[PDB]
Amino acid sequence: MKTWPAPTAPTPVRATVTVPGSKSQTNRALVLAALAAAQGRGASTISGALRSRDTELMLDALQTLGLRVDGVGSELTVSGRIEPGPGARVDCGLAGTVLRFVPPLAALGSVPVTFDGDQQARGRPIAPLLDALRELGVAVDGTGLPFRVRGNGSLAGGTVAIDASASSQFVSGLLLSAASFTDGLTVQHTGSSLPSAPHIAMTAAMLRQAGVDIDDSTPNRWQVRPGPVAARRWDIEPDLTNAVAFLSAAVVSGGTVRITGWPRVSVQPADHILAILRQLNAVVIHADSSLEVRGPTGYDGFDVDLRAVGELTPSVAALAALASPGSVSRLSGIAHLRGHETDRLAALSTEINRLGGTCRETPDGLVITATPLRPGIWRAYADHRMAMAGAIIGLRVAGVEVDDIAATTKTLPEFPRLWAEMVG
Numbered sequence: 001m002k003t004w005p006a007p008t009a010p011t012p013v014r015a016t017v018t019v020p021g022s023k024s025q026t027n028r029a030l031v032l033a034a035l036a037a038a039q040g041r042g043a044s045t046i047s048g049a050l051r052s053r054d055t056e057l058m059l060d061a062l063q064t065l066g067l068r069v070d071g072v073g074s075e076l077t078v079s080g081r082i083e084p085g086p087g088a089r090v091d092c093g094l095a096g097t098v099l100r101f102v103p104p105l106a107a108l109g110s111v112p113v114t115f116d117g118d119q120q121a122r123g124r125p126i127a128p129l130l131d132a133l134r135e136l137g138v139a140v141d142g143t144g145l146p147f148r149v150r151g152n153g154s155l156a157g158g159t160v161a162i163d164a165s166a167s168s169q170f171v172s173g174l175l176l177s178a179a180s181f182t183d184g185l186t187v188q189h190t191g192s193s194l195p196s197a198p199h200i201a202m203t204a205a206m207l208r209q210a211g212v213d214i215d216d217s218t219p220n221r222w223q224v225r226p227g228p229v230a231a232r233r234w235d236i237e238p239d240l241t242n243a244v245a246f247l248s249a250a251v252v253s254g255g256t257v258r259i260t261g262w263p264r265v266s267v268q269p270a271d272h273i274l275a276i277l278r279q280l281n282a283v284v285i286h287a288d289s290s291l292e293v294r295g296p297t298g299y300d301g302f303d304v305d306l307r308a309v310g311e312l313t314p315s316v317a318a319l320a321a322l323a324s325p326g327s328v329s330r331l332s333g334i335a336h337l338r339g340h341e342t343d344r345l346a347a348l349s350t351e352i353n354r355l356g357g358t359c360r361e362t363p364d365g366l367v368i369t370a371t372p373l374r375p376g377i378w379r380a381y382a383d384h385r386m387a388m389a390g391a392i393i394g395l396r397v398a399g400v401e402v403d404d405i406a407a408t409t410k411t412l413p414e415f416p417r418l419w420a421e422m423v424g
């Protein structure tokens, strides 16, 4: 495979960018639409849906379970029943949301369903969710990929305790299907360190939009009452995490990037994102239903806690590497990134140091000292966000090439074209 040369920005970037839909919101809407249709509530359409490998894996997963998902662009319509064929096998790819959100849903069928995924996915955490399903009465063969969920057409539900420190998706996956368990579900996270609170809150918010009653009033505990899931139209927001890769271009070049269709109130962690950008003294403004970021003339090192928004780490690490020479930045709260698409703490360390940088993995993150970088081959590890981090670096370092820019298809297949149009 040919590398992809990351274009440089010898002058400030100036651009209006539209990023496609939120992967997290699209895949939740697909699951909730599937549940409504399976309950006999009718078809649902999701408008502005992201079309990417992770959402194609989710809609193919629902079709493996027997549902129908129509739509060739961003408007997807879900209908039908959960009625898997003999030998049903869900391909999870490297999509955590398919791996974690579809085994519960699948426990609703009366035909077992096998789950498999990419070689690289087999290294990602999953066993605590499979133990939770067994505790809820589900027969599950296997403790890792490939595993089989032997549903009985019913799932009893009840109360379960789970260690979800490795992934908030274990909580979201249980919550999304819980209203269809006979008795609902009370889920308790045991211990501490629960990452990605905004993504569990995203789940709760979308459940309430579907008419599901969920009590999240006590931290680390969720109670979902059994009840119908409405068949409604879903309107998907732009992916704000991917927007940050583009906004980073403004930040490191002293330029100006606007993102269209930015929601003033979002189901995503918009407020965390805008606060981090403001930490680097970017000016951030809302205007014309768009978000405009103007980068500073320079920025020093920063400390940032990414526990709630760990998927920002690759872009934020690239920002830290490009701070004024000698600056030190500490990224913390992100031990769980060892279990992501790749071990992102190790990979970011490896690729920054390859370019001559100074990045030290810590027990919960990275310490990065901004030092002059040089050309190299930035490896993506089949991880869309490693690939985009290489693009951010290459804005300010000539001769940086990403090995596999097609890794961006996980959540942003048009990234090369969008990035090229932005840098111009």
Ligand SMILES: O=C(O)C1=C[C@@H](OP(=O)(O)O)[C@@H](O)[C@H](O)C1
Pocket (backbone or CB within 6 Å): 023, 024, 025, 096, 097, 166, 167, 168, 169, 172, 195, 196, 199, 310, 311, 336
């Ligand atoms: O539920 C979701 O949509 C996601 C939750 C987070 O997972 P972790 O809590 O496993 O980091 C986030 O990192 C992932 O990219 C998307």
